[PDB]
Design an enzyme around this catalytic site. Sequence first.
Site, PDB file in Angstrom:
ATOM      1  N   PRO A 106       0.659  -1.142  -0.324  1.00 48.29           N
ATOM      2  CA  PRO A 106      -0.586  -0.020   0.054  1.00 48.29           C
ATOM      3  C   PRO A 106       0.863   0.874   0.116  1.00 48.29           C
ATOM      4  CG  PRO A 106      -0.738  -0.983   2.077  1.00 48.29           C
ATOM      5  CD  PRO A 106       0.693  -1.894   0.774  1.00 48.29           C
ATOM      6  N   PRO A 129       0.955  -6.268   4.215  1.00 45.30           N
ATOM      7  CA  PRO A 129       1.949  -6.350   4.020  1.00 45.30           C
ATOM      8  C   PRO A 129       3.294  -6.246   4.563  1.00 45.30           C
ATOM      9  CG  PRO A 129       2.080  -6.915   1.518  1.00 45.30           C
ATOM     10  CD  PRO A 129       0.337  -5.986   2.658  1.00 45.30           C
ATOM     11  N   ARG A 174       4.799   1.548   1.856  1.00 44.25           N
ATOM     12  CA  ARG A 174       5.744   2.498   1.661  1.00 44.25           C
ATOM     13  C   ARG A 174       4.782   3.833   1.835  1.00 44.25           C
ATOM     14  NH1 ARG A 174       6.584  -0.905  -3.396  1.00 44.25           N
ATOM     15  NH2 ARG A 174       4.117  -1.597  -3.069  1.00 44.25           N
ATOM     16  N   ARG A 225     -10.576  -5.825  -1.533  1.00 48.58           N
ATOM     17  CA  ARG A 225     -10.904  -5.370  -0.050  1.00 48.58           C
ATOM     18  C   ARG A 225     -12.172  -5.068  -0.028  1.00 48.58           C
ATOM     19  NH1 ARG A 225      -5.001  -6.040   0.730  1.00 48.58           N
ATOM     20  NH2 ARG A 225      -4.056  -5.295  -0.947  1.00 48.58           N
TER      21      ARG A 225
END
EC number: 5.3.3.10
Lengths: 125, 125, 125
Positions: free
Chosen positions: A1, A35, A40, A71
């Site tokens: 993300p 994850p 970032r 999602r």
Amino acid sequence: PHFIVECSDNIREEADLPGLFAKVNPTLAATGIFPLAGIRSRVHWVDTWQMADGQHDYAFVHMTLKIGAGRSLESRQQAGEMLFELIKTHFAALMESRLLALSFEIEELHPTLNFKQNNVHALFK
Amino acid sequence: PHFIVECSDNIREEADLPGLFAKVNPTLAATGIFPLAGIRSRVHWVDTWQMADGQHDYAFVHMTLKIGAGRSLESRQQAGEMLFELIKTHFAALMESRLLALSFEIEELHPTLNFKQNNVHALFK
Amino acid sequence: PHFIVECSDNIREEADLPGLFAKVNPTLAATGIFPLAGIRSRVHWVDTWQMADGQHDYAFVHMTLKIGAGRSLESRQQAGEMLFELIKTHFAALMESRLLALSFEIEELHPTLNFKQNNVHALFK
């Protein structure tokens, strides 16, 4: 993300962006939807701005979380609130002592027109 | 709303962004659609870019207006047009004397995954 | 079109953005779909970021191609692949050598709320 921040440089020292990232990264990873090798976080400082009528010392922080498509709204709705709370808490001292505007939005990357090549996942996993 | 500008630094001085923001802020607010306390105008300077062939002294200004979801397409259309006329007028002496590309687009923030905390409303309102 | 890069400044000289742009611009134009006078490529350097756990010397490059709406998904897909192939090639040497993350997404501008004025088309044509 991708966690992207725009911040007026009049609050650059006090905003403590390193410390918010230090907290944000782990918080998103912990949700298990994101994850840690993929998180970032970065800031783009602004030296030239105009908030409202420009008559006071105004400061602003705009944040975008860009995530992979897929999602559910519910899952996004909840990671949002949770992260907005953390953000709110990070900036509370400032919100109580000066004029400040906080804004946070969540967007999805294109479902298929997405390309990536990242060697750090190797380090974790 | 968020008025975000990207500008090549070869025209950083002549572009007079502060001067553009001084006129954009009051014209958004006078539309009766955007509250003054919520308008945040900012520029991000670019020192490394390549326009077309990189063969001349090209300059560019890219502008994005991100607003809350829900205005009708026709509202947005007429606001974008009147804003664009002001912009063009602002850059007219530059458009006249040098190589310049102006681009402007209007984007909606996500309808529900949009969070905020702004204390400057208390000053207006 | 708009090719926007965000680059962590730990690879500021090794990245050779001017070098990527030198390749990117002509390859978009050679497609016959993207006018040369219209391609604007630029990088936003980041001096404050946190990738993952912030534990090592990570670097990241995030790229967005924003193009006008209406192109088939299939053309966008082939332009996306073709260009990710060239990005990968441009950084293959940094990749072998360090922690690096490459991300690339294609996005479209609103179909109607898009305004522009560019006097460089004249040089072309």
